[PDB]
Amino acid sequence: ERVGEKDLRAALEWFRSKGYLVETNKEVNPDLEITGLQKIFDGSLPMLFNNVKDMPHARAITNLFGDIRVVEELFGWENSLDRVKKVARAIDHPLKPVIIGQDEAPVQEEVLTTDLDVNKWLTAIRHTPLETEMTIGSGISCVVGPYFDGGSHIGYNRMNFRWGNVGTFQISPGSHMWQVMTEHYKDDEPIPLTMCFGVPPSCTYVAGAGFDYAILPKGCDEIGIAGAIQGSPVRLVKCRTIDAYTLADAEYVLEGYLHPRDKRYETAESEAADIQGRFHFHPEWAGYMGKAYKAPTFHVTAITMRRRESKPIIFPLGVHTADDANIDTSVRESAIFALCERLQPGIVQNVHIPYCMTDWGGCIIQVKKRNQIEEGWQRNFLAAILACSQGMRLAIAVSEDVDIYSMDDIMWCLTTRVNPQTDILNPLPGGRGQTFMPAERMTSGDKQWTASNTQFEGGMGIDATVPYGYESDFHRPVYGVDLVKPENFFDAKDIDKMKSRMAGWVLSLARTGR
Amino acid sequence: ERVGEKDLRAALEWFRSKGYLVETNKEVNPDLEITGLQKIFDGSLPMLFNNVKDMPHARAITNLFGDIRVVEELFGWENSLDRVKKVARAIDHPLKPVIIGQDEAPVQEEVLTTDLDVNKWLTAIRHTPLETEMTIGSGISCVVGPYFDGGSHIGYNRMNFRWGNVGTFQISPGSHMWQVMTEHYKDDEPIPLTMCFGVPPSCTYVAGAGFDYAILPKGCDEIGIAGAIQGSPVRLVKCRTIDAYTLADAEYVLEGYLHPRDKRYETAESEAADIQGRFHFHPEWAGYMGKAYKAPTFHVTAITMRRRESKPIIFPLGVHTADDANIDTSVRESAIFALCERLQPGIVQNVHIPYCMTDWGGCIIQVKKRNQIEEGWQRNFLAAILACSQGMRLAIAVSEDVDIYSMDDIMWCLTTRVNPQTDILNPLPGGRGQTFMPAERMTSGDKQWTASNTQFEGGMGIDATVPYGYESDFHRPVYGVDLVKPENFFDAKDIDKMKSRMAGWVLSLARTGR
Numbered sequence A, B: 001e002r003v004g005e006k007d008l009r010a011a012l013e014w015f016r017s018k019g020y021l022v023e024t025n026k027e028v029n030p031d032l033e034i035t036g037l038q039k040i041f042d043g044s045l046p047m048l049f050n051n052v053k054d055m056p057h058a059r060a061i062t063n064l065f066g067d068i069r070v071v072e073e074l075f076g077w078e079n080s081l082d083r084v085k086k087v088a089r090a091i092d093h094p095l096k097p098v099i100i101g102q103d104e105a106p107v108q109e110e111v112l113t114t115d116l117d118v119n120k121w122l123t124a125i126r127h128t129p130l131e132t133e134m135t136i137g138s139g140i141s142c143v144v145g146p147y148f149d150g151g152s153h154i155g156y157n158r159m160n161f162r163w164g165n166v167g168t169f170q171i172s173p174g175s176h177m178w179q180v181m182t183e184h185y186k187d188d189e190p191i192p193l194t195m196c197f198g199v200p201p202s203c204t205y206v207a208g209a210g211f212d213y214a215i216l217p218k219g220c221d222e223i224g225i226a227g228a229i230q231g232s233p234v235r236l237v238k239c240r241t242i243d244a245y246t247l248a249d250a251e252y253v254l255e256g257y258l259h260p261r262d263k264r265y266e267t268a269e270s271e272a273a274d275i276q277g278r279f280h281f282h283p284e285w286a287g288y289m290g291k292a293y294k295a296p297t298f299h300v301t302a303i304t305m306r307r308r309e310s311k312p313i314i315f316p317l318g319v320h321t322a323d324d325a326n327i328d329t330s331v332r333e334s335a336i337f338a339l340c341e342r343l344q345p346g347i348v349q350n351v352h353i354p355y356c357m358t359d360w361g362g363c364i365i366q367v368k369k370r371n372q373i374e375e376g377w378q379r380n381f382l383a384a385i386l387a388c389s390q391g392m393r394l395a396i397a398v399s400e401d402v403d404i405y406s407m408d409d410i411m412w413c414l415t416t417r418v419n420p421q422t423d424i425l426n427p428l429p430g431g432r433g434q435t436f437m438p439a440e441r442m443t444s445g446d447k448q449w450t451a452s453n454t455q456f457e458g459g460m461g462i463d464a465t466v467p468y469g470y471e472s473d474f475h476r477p478v479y480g481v482d483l484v485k486p487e488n489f490f491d492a493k494d495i496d497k498m499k500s501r502m503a504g505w506v507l508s509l510a511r512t513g514r
């Protein structure tokens, strides 16, 4: 039980071989140093901390998915478009996970069944100095089998263990865990599930997915999609205590039960005066400071991990980082692409969810109309995307002469290609939204800022595409950037001196010439 | 090659055993008698005509799917709700079709490779006296394999063979045949496909499906869904001439090639003066008289059929019949149910598309809100249904105290439960619609009434549901219809005399007491 063929340690070895690994040996605080160093180097190389404060048996990795280029190099993709198409193909073709014995799983070298103090072994962090609680935000849930209709689910859930071996368990309403909890709410037996830590990067990648249930409904095989992404099946193992399955190649696994009707407060102040949605609880995906709520409790029965002499790795990450944004929006991009290809194939060329929009709030699709009969399909695509995403606030459709990765080019399409009377779609006013957007706090009024009181404004679908047959009038003004060579006119020093000053939309426009 | 284990002949034997079969021996005209007798007995028992005018080798069945109760008795379903749930389960679990040899397929007893006059063997009908052409509207297309991404497609296409062995081939834009034609438009080799006639009733049932491609995308297995519906795999056989596969247990098969870039007019008058969308071409699904268009040509290379001494059965049906409505809207109902269950399970209770709405224009879903967090999901459902259906004009969401099969009860919900300022959704103005609705002719103007010139008004999503927490104010007024027995007060004669006068919404209200 010491090999994990494709896991976090092999990924660290590949990162060290490629030269992408930044590793230090100095003792780092989980309090306001890991997330601070992650935000200082946001969207960059992975950082490995060998020594963690008050965690003598644990290492810590961060910014693992921060640069999307090294992630695409890890999984063998050339660019983001190839990544989107390959992960859509992997969604439609899962690899069924294999079950190995309880003696070759590396996560079951040490099995703690007593003295269950989760905060002693797992590294809880604080993100900002405005917080009061150190929370565990590193684990993915793992529901395999009868509670997920014979499929499998992996996904992140934040936990605050402020009762020793009992901690809160934050569930987004509408998610797969919400659907499992809603089905088994009125039950006597609690839901058995495991929280896995230091998982293979494919499992992190698929655990980022969410609110894409027209493509990945309840009963799908998310671990199958992770196995299809890494190109080999993800190994499972039966738990020691509960009746479930874990990722065998993880670094830590918490086994236990979820009690849905046992709801407790996440912080001490919101418990002190009984108010959800007011007190600060570590910044959220929307790009604002989060709020503390009531949440069901996760009753840990066993802590299994690797050997503490091997120093198992945990992956703590801040929420408003490019790390967290890549983790969610990559597989959500390919799911949106899959839905638009299902509705009408051959029209959508590329789907991109930038860091700027949010995890669950926005997307940009790029359509190409081949004839007059395909005119109008972008409005079907925008309405279907906004309806099938639960609280996406802004979907933008652009034409094929646009750089989809530049927000300056998107703003140019918003300025020049949008009729404000006809091209703004508000499809579903009064539907379901995401309560973590404070624009829905503005609709709750003086009631409690919970999901029961918010009112969704309906989303915003912006059709910034060129009408068919008007491609000559909306033609983009390509210059002669390949008809002239600057090496004739200037030397190397003038050329790189002028090239060092360019940044952004000029860098996008100088490649394309438009 | 004389057994078809589950096919049209075995279904006729079961209908005769149950007493549902109405069979005559008098010679019926395909000109204005078959569709007339079908409309006289619309929504009733199957009619079998042994002698057809100028078709001495052919029998004709009609109103086969006219009564939905005998269809549910044929496939083993108790009511329509069980049918919707079972066909949704069959959609998510197809049975892979089997391939049998060319000598046990009953449709290949007689293989005609010369003298290909399709109108000599296949029965073309005229529906109304306003028409001029007798068209073939009995066959389903069958694309299996590489042209459908390794999946299979079955679906109806009307054909008018006015060049001997070359006929038009009407394709709805957006359909599976449209997607196949759009992918292989710019190709030199024509698309090989077979038109199958007198197919098993499961294949007719699944061939009715259309514009449900979030659930049944390109590359799905529609013959697999037919095999899952009948409970045994549908047998296939390799063609004699072209490189394709047919339904082995059919009665007639036309083998040939589809030429997409060879477009010809459907009638003689529209060919005479070059106008699509004006001249009458046999009433359509919208409930209006249809129009003649240009269409790609189907070049028949071989006619294979059963033995002419066995008198193979064809199934001609009028378009504005309950037959045709059941055929499309049954599997489309279960597809809409599957999509709403994928987005958020446990909320939608029942989906119904009545005969009154249309084939592709409307649907009624019935939701049940279990808590405050599920309030608003019906608007997501309405927007997703209207976006993922290509030109559904009217989707209505009602609560669970409504009889979904009574249009009077739906009109009552429209009167009493709709806020006209907030509960009318217009999600996708300017999207793709269905050109056969003349409300989109009103938007084409003085241009040609084609799909290239219509402008969709956006659909109409009506939220007629009760808001959560106001179930006491919107409570339906249940009387004491089971507290009193009429057999005490009156005799049998007064009771059935009073019961014979009740019809419609009073019949719905007297069962429920509301």
Ligand SMILES: CC(C)(COP(=O)(O)OP(=O)(O)OC[C@H]1O[C@@H](n2cnc3c(N)ncnc32)[C@H](O)[C@@H]1OP(=O)(O)O)[C@@H](O)C(=O)NCCC(=O)NCCSC(=O)c1ccccc1
Residues within 6 Å of the ligand: A158, A170, A171, A172, A173, A178, A181, A182, A183, A185, A263, A276, A284, A285, A293, A294, A295, A319, A324, A328, A359, A434, A435, A436, A449, A450, A451, A452, B370, B371, B372, B373
């Ligand atoms: C949505 C709740 C949980 C609603 O609680 P409250 O309003 O306080 O109301 P209650 O709790 O009292 O229950 C009401 C009554 O209804 C019933 N009932 C309830 N549930 C169910 C059920 N499932 N099934 C069936 N029934 C159910 C139940 O009977 C109950 O009555 P009882 O309890 O029997 O007396 C609220 O706590 C909240 O706002 N959570 C935060 C929402 C959120 O957005 N989290 C996002 C995290 S993602 C983010 O971190 C992230 C993303 C990406 C990257 C990074 C980060």
Ligand SMILES: CC(C)(COP(=O)(O)OP(=O)(O)OC[C@H]1O[C@@H](n2cnc3c(N)ncnc32)[C@H](O)[C@@H]1OP(=O)(O)O)[C@@H](O)C(=O)NCCC(=O)NCCSC(=O)c1ccccc1
Residues within 6 Å of the ligand: A370, A371, A372, A373, B158, B170, B171, B172, B173, B178, B181, B182, B183, B185, B263, B276, B284, B285, B293, B294, B295, B319, B324, B328, B359, B434, B435, B436, B449, B450, B451, B452
């Ligand atoms: C939609 C068309 C086919 C458009 O034709 P038109 O407007 O005359 O225009 P054109 O034909 O000239 O082509 C334009 C140019 O664009 C190109 N291009 C075209 N296509 C493609 C392609 N696929 N892929 C790629 N490219 C394509 C092509 O280059 C072409 O130029 P060329 O040809 O190279 O010079 C029209 O004929 C029509 O309205 N059909 C009826 C629509 C309908 O609703 N049928 C519903 C039946 S269901 C009902 O029966 C029913 C349902 C349920 C129960 C019962 C019953």
Ligand SMILES: [Ca+2]
Residues within 6 Å of the ligand: A325, A326, A329, A330, A333, A352, A353, A354, A355
């Ligand atoms: Ca992204």
Ligand SMILES: [Ca+2]
Residues within 6 Å of the ligand: B325, B326, B329, B330, B333, B352, B353, B354, B355
């Ligand atoms: Ca129906």
Ligand SMILES: [Fe+3]
Residues within 6 Å of the ligand: A152, A153, A154, A155, A176, A177, A222
């Ligand atoms: Fe999941």
Ligand SMILES: [Fe+3]
Residues within 6 Å of the ligand: A417, A418, A419, A423, A463, A464, A465, A466, A467
């Ligand atoms: Fe526009």
Ligand SMILES: [Fe+3]
Residues within 6 Å of the ligand: B152, B153, B154, B155, B176, B177, B222
């Ligand atoms: Fe099909």
Ligand SMILES: [Fe+3]
Residues within 6 Å of the ligand: B417, B418, B419, B423, B463, B464, B465, B466, B467
């Ligand atoms: Fe209402």
Ligand SMILES: [K+]
Residues within 6 Å of the ligand: A154, A155, A206, A207, A208, A209, A210, A222
């Ligand atoms: K996920």
Ligand SMILES: [K+]
Residues within 6 Å of the ligand: B154, B155, B206, B207, B208, B209, B210, B222
């Ligand atoms: K079909």
